Design a protein around this ligand. Structure first.
Ligand SMILES: NC(=O)c1ccc(N2CCOC2=O)cc1
Length: 124
């Protein structure tokens, strides 16, 4: 069974737009999105559809790139680090719920490497 997906707007949270956040959407997210291994991470895990009744019993801070994309589009974040933290939560969740060597873990490992490569240098 599925919890509500993470919020993508919050009126009492202040918004901001920065060059770095713009780059995270235009370049980082949009590029990762097209990778052959991106598909498992483009939406919240649907435990009912995927028959993973223990997923949310294990993962308490769910995150996915669809959520991140909507957050960036809504200027939800204060700064780039806040957004980078969501990517890191998404990768870490995958390593937590699964096991080394699993196909989905190999996917996350590859994406994480590409992600780090892209955020190594951000605009000023
Ligand atoms: N986020 C995860 O740990 C996760 C997500 C999806 C899967 N499934 C079910 C469909 O194929 C998969 O790899 C398995 C694990």
């Amino acid at each position: 069974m599925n919890p509500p997906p993470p919020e993508t707007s919050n009126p009492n949270k202040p918004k901001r737009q920065t060059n770095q956040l713009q780059y995270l959407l235009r370049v980082v997210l949009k590029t990762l999105w097209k990778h052959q291994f991106a598909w498992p991470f483009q939406q919240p895990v649907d435990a009912v559809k995927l028959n993973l009744p223990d997923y949310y019993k294990i993962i308490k801070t769910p995150m996915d790139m669809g959520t991140i994309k909507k957050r960036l589009e809504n200027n939800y974040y204060w700064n780039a680090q806040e957004c980078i933290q969501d990517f890191n939560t998404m990768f870490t969740n995958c390593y937590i719920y699964n096991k080394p060597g699993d196909d989905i873990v190999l996917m996350a490992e590859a994406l994480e490497k590409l992600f780090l490569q892209k955020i190594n240098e951000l605009p000023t």
